[PDB]
């Protein structure tokens, strides 16, 4: 996260860290949506251009963390993966369209003050909150500049009008994405960066006070570049697939 700030303890109990076994390193962010399922970006697991193709036994999921590098004994929980599911129509060849993936945990994780699932939006929540100007929150242990934070970082960013998103890049944007970030003349800044991928973009519903994950950190060109914006996978648009997988394999 660029131009963000230190997160408070328990501020994002659904935040998950995708951790590589050998060598031990931070791969991406992810989110907890139930006691047995984790949601992340498909490009965190599969991306042929960079010879990236991780399997179940190559990774570990670390839940309830705050510090990036330390093993937070008695606080965090590490889990193994039973199976990984990547959207069958994930387009890694062109624009990362449908950049989404689900991960089934070996065993259910127990919730606590630092481990709690985020909600998935229903049609109505998505319709009323996913609007230009409205702000969401992004979290992650990614780079601070286009070096690395000691603890989880947080930044609040406004959703941007589709036309502006389209006109800021040469990449073909689809309805399964939305972009966020401040405009070069708004003064404030901030953005996701390397290492933040797969992380959650959330919003708090003013109707029932619950937190909903509206997007997944997907892609960008540089980090916090003026006139550029971060792009996120539109979670609701792909909820049909999400539900299909869960009640068919869970």
């Amino acid at each position: 996260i660029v131009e963000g700030s230190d997160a408070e303890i328990g501020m994002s109990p659904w935040q998950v860290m995708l951790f590589r076994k050998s060598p031990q390193e931070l791969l991406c962010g992810a989110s907890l949506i139930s006691d047995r399922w984790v949601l992340t970006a498909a490009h965190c697991l599969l991306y042929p251009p960079w010879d990236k193709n991780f399997t179940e036994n190559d990774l570990l999921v670390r839940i309830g963390k705050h510090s990036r590098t330390r093993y937070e004994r008695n606080i965090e929980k590490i889990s193994m993966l039973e199976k990984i599911y990547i959207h069958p129509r994930y387009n890694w060849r062109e624009n990362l369209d449908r950049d989404i993936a689900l991960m089934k945990l070996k065993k259910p994780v127990a919730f606590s003050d630092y481990i709690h699932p985020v909600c998935l939006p229903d049609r109505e929540t998505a319709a009323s909150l996913l609007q230009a100007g409205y702000k969401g929150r992004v979290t992650g242990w990614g780079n601070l500049k286009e070096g690395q934070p000691s603890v989880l970082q947080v930044v609040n960013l406004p959703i941007v009008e589709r036309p502006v998103c389209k006109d800021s890049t040469r990449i073909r944007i689809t309805d399964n994405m939305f972009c966020a970030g401040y405009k070069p003349d708004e003064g404030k800044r901030g953005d996701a960066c390397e290492g933040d991928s797969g992380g959650p973009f959330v919003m708090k519903s003013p109707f029932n006070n619950r937190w909903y994950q509206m997007g997944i950190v997907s892609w960008g060109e540089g980090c916090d570049r003026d006139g550029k914006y971060g792009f996120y996978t539109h979670v609701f648009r792909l909820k049909k697939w999400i539900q299909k997988v869960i009640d068919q394999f869970g």
């Binding site: 700030s5 408070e8 303890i9 328990g10 501020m11 109990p13 949506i33 919730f111 606590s112 003050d113 630092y114 709690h116 699932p117 985020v118 909600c119 998935l120 909150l129 100007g133 409205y134 702000k135 969401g136 929150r137 947080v154 609040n156 406004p158 919003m203 708090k204 519903s205 003013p206 006070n209 619950r210 937190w211 909903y212």
Partner: peptide, 26 residues
């Protein structure tokens, strides 16, 4: 029970910047 944080909503405490979000939902 999703979306309600044990250390915040459950205790009726707000984090230091959530107000910014709520204020943007004009």
């Amino acid at each position: 029970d999703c979306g309600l944080r044990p250390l915040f909503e459950k205790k009726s405490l707000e984090d230091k910047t959530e107000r910014e979000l709520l204020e943007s939902y004009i």
